[PDB]
Amino acid sequence: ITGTSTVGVGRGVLGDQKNINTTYSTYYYLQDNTRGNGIFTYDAKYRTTLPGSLWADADNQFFASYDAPAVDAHYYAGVTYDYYKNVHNRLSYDGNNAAIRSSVHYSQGYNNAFWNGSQMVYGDGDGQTFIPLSGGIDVVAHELTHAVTDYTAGLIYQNESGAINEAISDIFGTLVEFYANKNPDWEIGEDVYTPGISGDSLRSMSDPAKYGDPDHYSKRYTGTQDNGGVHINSGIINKAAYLISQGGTHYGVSVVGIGRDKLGKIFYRALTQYLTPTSNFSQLRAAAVQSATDLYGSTSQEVASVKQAFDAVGVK
Ligand SMILES: Oc1cccc(Br)c1
Ligand SMILES: Oc1cccc(Br)c1
Ligand SMILES: [Ca+2]
Ligand SMILES: [Ca+2]
Ligand SMILES: [Ca+2]
Ligand SMILES: [Ca+2]
Ligand SMILES: [Zn+2]
């Protein structure tokens, strides 16, 4: 809507106070004008009609329990925006400051969050498996990253190209979590998963096998469920990405780590210049090698490390 930019204050899902960019016109709306063409957060009011209504608040203070998932969806969209702009010179997901829209309170006890082709959608969880999913900065940035993947490489959501699509989202979801630098790790969803169990997550990049996902190509899932294993076989690529950044010896293959920022530059370039809708894992390796070549030279350690990492997870 049309109005004046203001700054509200509230608490997120985990109880943390933060400032949020709002817009005043009779009510205060969750409309951030400071980023691109706007960041907009909506109330789906426990239903599945989207987007629902632009979030409106009488007094610019967002401390009610009902408010917390909106606060975090709105704030973490901003953080994700800032990551892509400041780190990769990318202005929103289309590169031309497309509006970022998110709906919270989607359905009842909905244990998921997704990008629907046009906007973000967040369930509140059932309180046992998940709490409201926008509380997870890695979840927010994972799912927002699909918007850019769909706009750039366009990796189809099935079989190996799908698993790459998923790994890309885990990779940048994690790098945004490190960017924000609040309890960062290489695990996915730890801040919103199983409130009664500490130390767990839904997936691990550092050790995919912790939660039954493959960490080697020879262990890939070959079946038809999960669209040919897109959320399973992502572990193979997540492990490769982890090794490129952190190093290690995996199934006897040693990798020299080159750190998170170079990981991010290599995979961003691969995503936006070399991958295609039907890329497979071998093609991902080639794209990552070419990207690292472009950035650091054919003879660099960075290139050697990318090759070692893919060797380590069995991808030729
Ligand atoms: O996928 C993207 C890219 C840039 C900004 C945001 Br928010 C999401
Ligand atoms: O990408 C997502 C969506 C929902 C939960 C988790 Br963990 C990750
Ligand atoms: Ca209020
Ligand atoms: Ca964390
Ligand atoms: Ca995490
Ligand atoms: Ca937990
Ligand atoms: Zn995903």
Domain of 22, CATH number, reads 3.10.170.10
Nearest CA, atom 3, ligand 2: 113
- β-strand 56-57 against 53-54: which pairing, if any? unpaired
In angstroms, rounded to a whole number, what is the distance separating the alpha carbons of residues 4 and 197?
43
DSSP secondary structure string, 94-153? TSS---EEEEEEESSS---EEE-SSSEEEE---SSSBS-GGG-HHHHHHHHHHHHHHHTT
Q: How many CB atoms lie within 10 A of CB 212?
A: 10
The two three-digit tokens of residue 171, written as one number: 């990779």
Residue 163 and residue 144 share a domain: no
Is 1 part of a structural domain of the chain?
no
Last residue of a domain, one of 154, 188, 214: 154
Instruction: Tell me if 243 sits within 8 A of 256, measured CB to CB.
Output: no
What's the CA gap between 238 and 168, in Å, rounded?
Answer: 8
Residue 130 lies in a domain: yes
- Residue 302 structure tokens: 């960075």
Q: Per the domain annotation, does 225 fall within a domain?
A: yes
193 is in an annotated binding site: yes
Same domain, 52 and 97: yes
| CB 310 within 8 Å of CB 240 | yes
Q: 49: which residues sit within 8 A by CB, 6+ positions away?
A: none
Residues 119 and 226 in one domain: no
**Contact partners, residue 252, CB within 8 Å, separation at least 6:** none
Q: Do 137 and 79 meet the contact criterion of CB atoms below 8 Å apart?
A: yes
Q: How far apart are CA 287 and CA 90, in angstroms?
A: 20
Nearest in space to 267 (alpha carbons), one of 152, 157, 143: 152
The answer to the question of whether 194 is labelled as a binding residue is yes
Residue 144 lies in a domain: yes
Residues 144 and 177 in one domain: no
State this model's resolution in angstroms: 1.7
Quick one: 149 and 165 in the same domain? no
Which of these three, 119, 135, 154, is where a domain ends? 154
CA atoms in the 13 A half-sphere facing the CB of 274: 20
Last residue of a domain, one of 87, 119, 154: 154
Same domain, 209 and 123: no
- CA dist 29 and 2 (Å) reads 10
Domain around 238: 155-315
User: Both 126 and 165 in a single domain?
Assistant: no
Tell me how many degrees the CA angle 58-60-64 measures, rounded to the nearest 5.
Answer: 80
> In this structure, what DSSP letter does residue 154 have?
-
For residue 193, how many other CB atoms are within 10 A of its CB?
21
Q: Cα–Cα distance between 182 and 268 in angstroms, integer?
A: 23
Looking at the structure, tell me whether residues 185 and 149 fall in a common domain: no
Are 31 and 144 found together in one domain? yes
Q: Residue 161: inside a domain, yes or no?
A: yes
Residue 16 CA to ligand 3 center (angstroms) comes to 16
Ligand that comes closest to the CA of residue 197: 6
Which atom from ligand 2 is nearest to the alpha carbon of 189? 7
CA–CA distance, 316 with 312 (Å, rounded to integer) = 10
- 61 and 192 together in one domain: no
Is residue 275 within 8 Å of residue 153, measured between CB atoms? yes
Give the domain CATH number at 253. Answer: 1.10.390.10
Rg (CA), the chain: 19
285: nearest Cα among 262, 311, 255:
311
Q: Does residue 256 form part of some domain?
A: yes
Q: Which atom of ligand 1 is nearest to the CA of 141?
A: 8
Beta-carbon count within 10 A of 96 CB = 11
CB atoms within 10 A of CB 5: 12
Q: Where in 223-279 does DSSP place strands (E)?
A: 248-250, 253-255
Determined by: X-ray
- Verify that 140 and 161 share a domain, yes or no: no
Residue with CA nearest ligand 2 atom 7? 189
Written as six digits, the tokens of 62 are 């967002």
Residue 8 to residue 23: CA distance in whole angstroms: 9
161 residue type, one letter? S
What is the total count of domains within the chain? Answer: 2
Half-sphere exposure of 111 (CA within 13 A, CB side): 9
DSSP three-state, residue 306: helix
In a domain, 270, yes or no: yes
List active site positions. 143, 231
Within this chain, do residues 277 and 181 fall inside the same structural domain, yes or no?
A: yes
CA 69 to ligand 3 centroid distance, Å: 14
Indicate which ligand has the atom closest to the C-alpha of 195: 6
Number of H helices, E strands in the chain: 8, 15
Element (H, E) at 204: strand 203-204
Assigned token pair, 190: 């730890």
